[PDB]
Amino acid sequence: YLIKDFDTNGLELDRERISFEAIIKGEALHSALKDLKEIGCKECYVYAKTEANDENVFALISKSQLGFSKIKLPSNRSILEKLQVFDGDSTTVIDGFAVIGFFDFTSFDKIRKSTKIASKVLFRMDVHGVLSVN
Amino acid sequence: SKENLPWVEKYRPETLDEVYGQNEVITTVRKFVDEGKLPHLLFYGPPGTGKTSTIVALAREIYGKNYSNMVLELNASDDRGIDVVRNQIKDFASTRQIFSKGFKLIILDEADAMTNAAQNALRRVIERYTKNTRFCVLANYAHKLTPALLSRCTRFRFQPLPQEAIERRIANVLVHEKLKLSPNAEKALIELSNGDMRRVLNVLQSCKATLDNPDEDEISDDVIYECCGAPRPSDLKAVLKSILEDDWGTAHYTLNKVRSAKGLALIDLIEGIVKILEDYELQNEETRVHLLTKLADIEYSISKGGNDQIQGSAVIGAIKASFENET
Amino acid sequence: GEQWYEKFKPNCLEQVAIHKRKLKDVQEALDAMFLPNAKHRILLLSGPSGCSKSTVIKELSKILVPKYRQNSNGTSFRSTPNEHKVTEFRGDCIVNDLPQMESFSEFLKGARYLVMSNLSLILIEDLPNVFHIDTRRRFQQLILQWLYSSEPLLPPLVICITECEIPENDNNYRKFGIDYTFSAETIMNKEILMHPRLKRIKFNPINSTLLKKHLKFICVQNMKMLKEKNKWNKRQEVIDYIAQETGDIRSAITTLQFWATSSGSLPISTRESTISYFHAIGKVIHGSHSTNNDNEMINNLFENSNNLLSKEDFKLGILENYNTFNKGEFSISDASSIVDCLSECDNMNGLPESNEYGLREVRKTFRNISKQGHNHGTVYFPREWKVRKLQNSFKVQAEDWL
Amino acid sequence: LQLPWVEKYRPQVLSDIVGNKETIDRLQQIAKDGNMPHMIISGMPGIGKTTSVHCLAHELLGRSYADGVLELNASDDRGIDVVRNQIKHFAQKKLHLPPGKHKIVILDEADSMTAGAQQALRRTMELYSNSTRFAFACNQSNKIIEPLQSRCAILRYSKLSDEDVLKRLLQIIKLEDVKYTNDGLEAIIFTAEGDMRQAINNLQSTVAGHGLVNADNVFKIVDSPHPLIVKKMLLASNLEDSIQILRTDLWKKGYSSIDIVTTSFRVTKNLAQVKESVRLEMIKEIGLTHMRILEGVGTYLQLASMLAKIHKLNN
Amino acid sequence: SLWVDKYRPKSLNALSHNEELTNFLKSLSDQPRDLPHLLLYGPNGTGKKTRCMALLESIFGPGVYRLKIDVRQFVTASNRKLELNVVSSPYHLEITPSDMGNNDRIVIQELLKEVAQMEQHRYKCVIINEANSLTKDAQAALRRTMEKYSKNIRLIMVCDSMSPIIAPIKSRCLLIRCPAPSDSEISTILSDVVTNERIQLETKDILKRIAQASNGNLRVSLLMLESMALNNELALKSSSPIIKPDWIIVIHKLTRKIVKERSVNSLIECRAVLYDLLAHCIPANIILKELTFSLLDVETLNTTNKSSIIEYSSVFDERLSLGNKAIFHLEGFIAKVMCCLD
Amino acid sequence: SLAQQPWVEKYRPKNLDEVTAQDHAVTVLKKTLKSANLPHMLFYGPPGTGKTSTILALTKELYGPDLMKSRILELNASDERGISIVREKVKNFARLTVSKPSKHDLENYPCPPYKIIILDEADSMTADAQSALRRTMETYSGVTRFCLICNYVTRIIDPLASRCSKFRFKALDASNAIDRLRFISEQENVKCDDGVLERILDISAGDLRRGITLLQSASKGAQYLGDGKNITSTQVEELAGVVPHDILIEIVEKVKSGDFDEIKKYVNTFMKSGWSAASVVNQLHEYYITNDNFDTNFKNQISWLLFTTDSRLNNGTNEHIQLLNLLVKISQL
DNA sequence: CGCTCCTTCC
DNA sequence: GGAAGGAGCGTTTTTTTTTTTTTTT
Ligand SMILES: Nc1ncnc2c1ncn2[C@@H]1O[C@H](COP(=O)(O)OP(=O)(O)OP(O)(O)=S)[C@@H](O)[C@H]1O
Ligand SMILES: Nc1ncnc2c1ncn2[C@@H]1O[C@H](COP(=O)(O)OP(=O)(O)OP(O)(O)=S)[C@@H](O)[C@H]1O
Ligand SMILES: Nc1ncnc2c1ncn2[C@@H]1O[C@H](COP(=O)(O)OP(=O)(O)OP(O)(O)=S)[C@@H](O)[C@H]1O
Ligand SMILES: Nc1ncnc2c1ncn2[C@@H]1O[C@H](COP(=O)(O)OP(=O)(O)OP(O)(O)=S)[C@@H](O)[C@H]1O
Ligand SMILES: Nc1ncnc2c1ncn2[C@@H]1O[C@H](COP(=O)(O)OP(=O)(O)O)[C@@H](O)[C@H]1O
Ligand SMILES: [Mg+2]
Ligand SMILES: [Mg+2]
Ligand SMILES: [Mg+2]
Ligand SMILES: [Mg+2]
């Protein structure tokens, strides 16, 4: 078919300013996405936070007919490996600032199948609010 | 390449600078974008006045190369039911910006074909998401639009293109592609266009195709009429004079000769005679009433298809009877 | 905080705003249905909004169920006497392991067991989603099975249907009977309505006398605030207005409370009542007393009753009943003009302004020849349906002969 | 990109709403007392129905507005399942609002809900009325089924008067320090036709496009209303004048024939200057022309013939 | 068996009236390879279907007269069942889409196209009864179906009036006029029938009356001849009364009532008779025509009354053609006629 | 197919070179043979003017037998053309990439970079379906071209008529299509008197299909007769269905002598012969208008009378009633 | 929206 | 025993396209 005038490359992540970046196991993320799908999630919240003494928090908060539910990943290296919350710069890491991204679950659930076969998942949020998943 | 495209698409304006005949609207939109105070837009107008072209050029100017992901365009050819409005448009208007390029534009082309439920659902979407989202509604028939949607959109009326704008665009087309157009041919083209640029471009393309060698041959009024098949003004004048002065047999012979020499259609002749009569001196209103009613009835009969000779004789008799009221 | 129409609810059968004749008829029918082997199995109550159908049903149940309910021998669920005189169906119940259309069935299959020692009056006021075609078919089939059932004992079944119009909505494009009117005829079918074991009693709007009496009682009950706010001396007029504005007791009480609570002076208004078919025909033919300008009346009727006036049934009724003006003794020219106008309207592809033209022509023609000394005939529903049925029979017979 | 003044200066308290002073005072008394009943607010678009309902809910609740208001709308799904689950659970929710307050369910644009949804609303209101109240907002009150109307107090909002529109426009101009004159404000009010949202939008467009507000500047952005031009065309003594109006003011300005015919019918419906028979004949001719246009002949000659027939009927 | 069918000619040579049409049919069947689509238009009862069957027999032999019937089911857009009794033969096919009302278009799209695609090398002949009753959409759909698949199928259509036929169809078909039989030919046919049936007759004039009471329709002529013969114990006398269709007598009585009583109550009473006639599935247009021409036969009325009657009849016939419900226009015609007469 | 097809189907133009009387548009269609610049086309005209044949020949010329089956999508009234079809099938075909031409077709045929969608009989499409075709016709104009064929141009919505270059197919008469009919007759060895072909064209009233069918019928009749005599005008008139001049004269005489009883009796007798009301109405119009023995006012009234009766007939009215009313009304005048 | 008839008040 | 108020009467026929909800899946 004729190539759509729309450029599919228009959506990309700016590497200069990354709000935060995370590494997670594929199995845990797939389980969390399945859990959100079961409860009929309508809106999703990606919450990321880094604090002192090696404190890492990555959570998915679902707004649905159940109300508000929370799924938080552990701090174990085997599941959640390594986290930064840069605050926008990709150079300096600060502690205490929480990055929150609000998404429609319709778009968020389109990566569950890709995550089922995943062996590793890299999450990245920029200041502009675009979520990148490798 | 673009040479393959029809002139109606090859000569599509790429920037607002190429848009002619909408100077007030163009300037208002320029000021809106320059001051960053563009409101919800409702471009209402007849076909081929430059609404889609104007909005596309505006989107190009605002964003540039990002027009792909900064603007969401929906038209009649696509599904625009209540479900589409509730999911696709809502998702597009409720998401952040790729590069903070001011706002996200939604071009609801041919929105007059949308369902009432879809418009009702879209009104509150328009109201809720306005900080970083904008709506443009293009229409040719306002009565199909709900009153609330009309009230919530700033209305811009696209008048029929003035003569000067069409002459400028014809000059640009001729300069772009080597071709000569006679002043009489240009005047006839303007008259038959009735403020439609699509007709202008189509007739120009077909008239170039009519000319044997489009290198040194100049377009003339005869070529324009032959290509379009419409009657020349002289034929209309002659047939009207015969009807209003000559006898029944002479009038019938004149009409038959006029419409058989070039195979003219009776609908075009009736329209031309109506236009000519609209600017005549009448001393009585009943004459005008008879002319208008009988001619409208005859056109309505012609629209459904019938006996051509019967309809022609009907036109002649209606004109003769109506003009008998005078004096 | 509590709304008055709920606070001032009847505590006995004598406080229900129901006419004596209708109340006696309902009592007799319900008592008959409670007999050991009752001929009637279903009580179909149909009427407008707020005519005290459910109220009178519950009040009568409170007196009847204790009389016939067989005494228990310690088999009651709880220590309480099981105060469940009325068992009602809830249309928004969503159990886990059950399809939606099967909800009502699951109710009915349970309702059969509420007999003898577990006697209870089965009331169906909150109907299932009858707008869904499959749900409506299942509901009709279940009702038919109940009527044709073969159990020695069944509990009395009462179906209260609030007859109201369905406003023309954009989300709905179908033009079925239920899409136009929500009544017993559209919800049920001919077989159920004509069943010998089903009794249908039609309720009427509450008359002005009962409304005035109950409004006066309500005002007397709340005397401190009315006297304090200086609205007592003018209460009567307000009540009168309500009495002549609506037949809905609930709406009347709500309007009275709204007027009383207002500290200033807000105009008194009540819910709008749809004009019936014969009422609309009479308005078109003989006119309206509440208005003298025909244009205003016709505009109001079209704006408020567009659904009824758009159908060809109204045009056929006008054609059928235009001759009852003076028992037919009026100039034939007027009849010819009316029929010619209706015929020419028939060619306008059912445009709304074609209906406007027809109704306005009829109104003008009847106003021209109107006089004080007029005696009218009887209004009859057009017999196009009978012609269609005869045509269908003719088609069947012709097919057989062929 | 500053927000448009239709939203930037949206009233937040009921005291800032101009027009319909009696109903607004009643709403203020309701907010003060707190005993809000089920209500239906009907009126013309853009007169302050949604704003009034939202302001009343805000004043009633305050810190509990988020947890005590369930705003549904046409853009949101409002089917029978929605009533069965979301509205039902919201009504069942037990709050701790002050003694004289109740949860508010704002069903904006309620005149578009499905029949089954309204039938379920009957039961949900019959059962959850002790702690939940419904504030329907619509344009036509009859679009709500009678069983639901029976439980709701009806408030009909009237068209805005010129004085209220002028007062609010002056307040907005003073807040924005916009330069204005008398003729410009008069033109804005005249073109508003009682719709304050339209008035604000036209004022903003005029100031942003031409700066100082003038009669000519306002007329540039906003044309004369179509219904008034149509009424002038219909009410004419000479057929020539009506034809001239139709050509210059309607046909040459880019108005479709179908729109002209529909507005002509609407105007003839509400015109009260001639006898019933004349208006009836005009409606008949308008209908014939509408028929002839719907089949494809949307030509100027058809409108001219319609005008000629109307003029003949008048004489 | 009914004498109408048991005497039906089964060959072109058997025809004894309208010899010009018989010769034209012979010419058409002379080279049955390039036969174009045919549209036979003529007054009802002339024998158009008989002529079509005779031509089909002369072309494809005698299997056409061996008719078979089948049930073909149709599913519409709304999943609605439709049943059309398909009359088929090993050499031809017959269909009456008018029985499907406004759904006839589907028959044009799903039946004719599918069979046309199938290849029989000779062609198949399809007959459409009451072509003028086809909706405009069906006629439009027929155009390219006929044009594209002329190799496989040749179409035969029959009608009593070409007015409701769209111009493209008339362009795509070869028109054949079928004049109705004259009084003499009907008299000869009836004489042969009575002679072969061993029925007694007194004078031939009776047959002429049988020809006059029908006035072109041979089917009703034979039916009423049989009715008279059986009623009179197989002895037709000169004074034997002529039996007419019941609805005809009803219409004449209604006309007499209209003439006698020009009043509103008279209109109301006539409305019931109109309802009964419509309930007998009598077409509204034929009702209007018969009422008009019964009224025009009244001796009391003068020229002006008759002219007004015919004007109103034509106007209301157009309104019936363009209208949905038929009662309005019939009642309006009657009311206007009564107003003028008064 | 040489002797097993109708003459109309066997003589369908195969190439644009043999289209007879559509030069005003055939020249434009030919000059774009090597232009790669074919625009969207709207052919409109009366029945049997050579619209489908023209587009089929154009497609054959540009693509050829092998490539035609892939670059052409044809839809007509017989096909179901609902709004959903327009949205899905037409859009999908328009958005498709043009199939790669082979070596042979490129060597021998232009093979333009665009395909064709032919919506024959577009006047039968609903307004909404026509609206759904507006932007599709424009978005994919670089790889697709549209052709809409119709008899009633007014039935096409204004936006589509604006989006398409309009070609009017003129009526074919004895001065435009005599050559084609003469060629067909010569190839079919059909014999006729001088002016017979002109009479057939005049009877056709601007429809070469009707003329060809009438010529085929006349040839069949002549062959069956087997007399070796040229076909005369009488035979073509009789097979065409034209009322004989004698019947017209008798009708005129009855009308002139105003008498309702006599007129209605004669009308009943005439209509019991199977004649068509349209033909007799046309003949009466010709006779009355062309006659110089009548006053101007009578012609003015009779023109409107004939127009009204013809309009009534086109609506599908009873021919008997309409003819009787027309005759009575002319008698009154 | 009237007719007709039945209840009730007075 | 007029006078007013009120009840009962007076009612049921399909079917083009398209969109949309509902339910099941
Ligand atoms: N102002 C203009 N200046 C130059 N060319 C124009 C102008 N308006 C229209 N055209 C030409 O005509 C074509 C019409 O394009 P559109 O902008 O879609 O017309 P339109 O006003 O949208 O008609 P509708 O309402 O969609 S049918 C353009 O692609 C140009 O080729
Ligand atoms: N005196 C009274 N008589 C009857 N109902 C009363 C009275 N006073 C208050 N009401 C209330 O008014 C309301 C109307 O009565 P309902 O019987 O519920 O109406 P309805 O006949 O059921 O109409 P629907 O279908 O419920 S809208 C009920 O909530 C009653 O409790
Ligand atoms: N009475 C009023 N006083 C002051 N501002 C008003 C008034 N009415 C409308 N406005 C302004 O117009 C804006 C839109 O008003 P809304 O109340 O949303 O319209 P509306 O009356 O609800 O019409 P609908 O129902 O949404 S179509 C408000 O945000 C105000 O800025
Ligand atoms: N210009 C022409 N030159 C030669 N033969 C023609 C011409 N026009 C029509 N014909 C003949 O008549 C037949 C008519 O075919 P079409 O081209 O489909 O007619 P048409 O213009 O499509 O009529 P409509 O509009 O579909 S009813 C052709 O197959 C030819 O046999
Ligand atoms: N030429 C004929 N000779 C004898 N009988 C005929 C002839 N033509 C028709 N009929 C008779 O007329 C009857 C009805 O004819 P029919 O086929 O119904 O005509 P149409 O097709 O015009 O309605 C047939 O039963 C047939 O017996
Ligand atoms: Mg556009
Ligand atoms: Mg109740
Ligand atoms: Mg609102
Ligand atoms: Mg064709």
mmCIF file of N, CA, C and O in Angstrom, chain B residues 143, chain D residues 225-231 233-234 250 255-269 286:
data_model
loop_
_atom_site.group_PDB
_atom_site.id
_atom_site.type_symbol
_atom_site.label_atom_id
_atom_site.label_comp_id
_atom_site.label_asym_id
_atom_site.label_seq_id
_atom_site.Cartn_x
_atom_site.Cartn_y
_atom_site.Cartn_z
ATOM 1 N N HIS B 143 -26.818 23.507 9.096
ATOM 2 C CA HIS B 143 -27.999 22.967 9.759
ATOM 3 C C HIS B 143 -27.803 21.528 10.218
ATOM 4 O O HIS B 143 -28.541 21.067 11.095
ATOM 5 N N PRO D 225 -26.689 37.638 12.002
ATOM 6 C CA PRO D 225 -27.249 36.290 12.151
ATOM 7 C C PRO D 225 -28.098 35.898 10.952
ATOM 8 O O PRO D 225 -28.848 36.706 10.401
ATOM 9 N N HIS D 226 -27.969 34.634 10.555
ATOM 10 C CA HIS D 226 -28.724 34.132 9.413
ATOM 11 C C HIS D 226 -30.232 34.240 9.615
ATOM 12 O O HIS D 226 -30.928 34.652 8.667
ATOM 13 N N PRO D 227 -30.795 33.893 10.779
ATOM 14 C CA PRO D 227 -32.257 33.978 10.932
ATOM 15 C C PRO D 227 -32.826 35.366 10.692
ATOM 16 O O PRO D 227 -33.912 35.481 10.115
ATOM 17 N N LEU D 228 -32.142 36.427 11.127
ATOM 18 C CA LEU D 228 -32.674 37.772 10.918
ATOM 19 C C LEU D 228 -32.691 38.139 9.439
ATOM 20 O O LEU D 228 -33.662 38.733 8.951
ATOM 21 N N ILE D 229 -31.630 37.792 8.708
ATOM 22 C CA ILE D 229 -31.613 38.043 7.270
ATOM 23 C C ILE D 229 -32.740 37.275 6.596
ATOM 24 O O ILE D 229 -33.424 37.793 5.704
ATOM 25 N N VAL D 230 -32.951 36.025 7.013
ATOM 26 C CA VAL D 230 -34.016 35.219 6.424
ATOM 27 C C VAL D 230 -35.379 35.831 6.720
ATOM 28 O O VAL D 230 -36.263 35.862 5.856
ATOM 29 N N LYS D 231 -35.579 36.303 7.950
ATOM 30 C CA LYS D 231 -36.844 36.934 8.305
ATOM 31 C C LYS D 231 -37.087 38.178 7.463
ATOM 32 O O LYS D 231 -38.203 38.404 6.983
ATOM 33 N N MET D 233 -35.920 38.675 4.488
ATOM 34 C CA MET D 233 -36.240 38.177 3.153
ATOM 35 C C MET D 233 -37.699 37.743 3.057
ATOM 36 O O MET D 233 -38.384 38.056 2.077
ATOM 37 N N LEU D 234 -38.190 37.020 4.065
ATOM 38 C CA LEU D 234 -39.561 36.521 4.026
ATOM 39 C C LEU D 234 -40.565 37.662 4.137
ATOM 40 O O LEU D 234 -41.520 37.741 3.355
ATOM 41 N N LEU D 250 -27.445 36.396 0.946
ATOM 42 C CA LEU D 250 -27.444 34.966 1.231
ATOM 43 C C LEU D 250 -26.693 34.150 0.191
ATOM 44 O O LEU D 250 -25.786 33.389 0.548
ATOM 45 N N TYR D 255 -24.015 30.715 1.347
ATOM 46 C CA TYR D 255 -24.981 29.961 2.135
ATOM 47 C C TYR D 255 -25.642 28.911 1.252
ATOM 48 O O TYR D 255 -26.125 29.226 0.160
ATOM 49 N N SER D 256 -25.656 27.668 1.725
ATOM 50 C CA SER D 256 -26.253 26.584 0.958
ATOM 51 C C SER D 256 -27.770 26.728 0.914
ATOM 52 O O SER D 256 -28.394 27.292 1.817
ATOM 53 N N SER D 257 -28.365 26.203 -0.159
ATOM 54 C CA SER D 257 -29.811 26.304 -0.330
ATOM 55 C C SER D 257 -30.552 25.567 0.780
ATOM 56 O O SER D 257 -31.596 26.030 1.254
ATOM 57 N N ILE D 258 -30.035 24.410 1.196
ATOM 58 C CA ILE D 258 -30.706 23.629 2.232
ATOM 59 C C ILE D 258 -30.756 24.410 3.540
ATOM 60 O O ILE D 258 -31.784 24.428 4.231
ATOM 61 N N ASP D 259 -29.653 25.068 3.902
ATOM 62 C CA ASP D 259 -29.649 25.884 5.111
ATOM 63 C C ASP D 259 -30.669 27.009 5.011
ATOM 64 O O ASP D 259 -31.397 27.285 5.973
ATOM 65 N N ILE D 260 -30.741 27.661 3.849
ATOM 66 C CA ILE D 260 -31.686 28.757 3.661
ATOM 67 C C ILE D 260 -33.116 28.262 3.826
ATOM 68 O O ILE D 260 -33.939 28.908 4.483
ATOM 69 N N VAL D 261 -33.438 27.108 3.236
ATOM 70 C CA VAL D 261 -34.798 26.586 3.332
ATOM 71 C C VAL D 261 -35.133 26.204 4.772
ATOM 72 O O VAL D 261 -36.233 26.491 5.264
ATOM 73 N N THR D 262 -34.205 25.542 5.469
ATOM 74 C CA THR D 262 -34.481 25.155 6.851
ATOM 75 C C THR D 262 -34.694 26.376 7.737
ATOM 76 O O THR D 262 -35.629 26.409 8.550
ATOM 77 N N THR D 263 -33.845 27.396 7.595
ATOM 78 C CA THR D 263 -34.017 28.597 8.405
ATOM 79 C C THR D 263 -35.293 29.341 8.023
ATOM 80 O O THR D 263 -35.945 29.943 8.881
ATOM 81 N N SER D 264 -35.667 29.316 6.739
ATOM 82 C CA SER D 264 -36.927 29.923 6.328
ATOM 83 C C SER D 264 -38.106 29.240 7.006
ATOM 84 O O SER D 264 -39.023 29.908 7.500
ATOM 85 N N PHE D 265 -38.098 27.907 7.041
ATOM 86 C CA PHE D 265 -39.161 27.186 7.733
ATOM 87 C C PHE D 265 -39.183 27.536 9.216
ATOM 88 O O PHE D 265 -40.251 27.785 9.793
ATOM 89 N N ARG D 266 -38.009 27.571 9.851
ATOM 90 C CA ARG D 266 -37.956 27.880 11.276
ATOM 91 C C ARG D 266 -38.490 29.282 11.554
ATOM 92 O O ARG D 266 -39.225 29.492 12.526
ATOM 93 N N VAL D 267 -38.130 30.252 10.714
ATOM 94 C CA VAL D 267 -38.604 31.619 10.905
ATOM 95 C C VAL D 267 -40.112 31.689 10.706
ATOM 96 O O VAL D 267 -40.832 32.301 11.505
ATOM 97 N N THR D 268 -40.617 31.064 9.639
ATOM 98 C CA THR D 268 -42.052 31.095 9.382
ATOM 99 C C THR D 268 -42.833 30.445 10.513
ATOM 100 O O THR D 268 -43.979 30.828 10.776
ATOM 101 N N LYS D 269 -42.239 29.462 11.195
ATOM 102 C CA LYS D 269 -42.928 28.844 12.324
ATOM 103 C C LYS D 269 -43.218 29.862 13.422
ATOM 104 O O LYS D 269 -44.327 29.896 13.968
ATOM 105 N N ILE D 286 -42.592 26.266 1.293
ATOM 106 C CA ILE D 286 -41.263 25.965 1.814
ATOM 107 C C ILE D 286 -41.021 24.463 1.808
ATOM 108 O O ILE D 286 -39.925 23.997 1.479
#
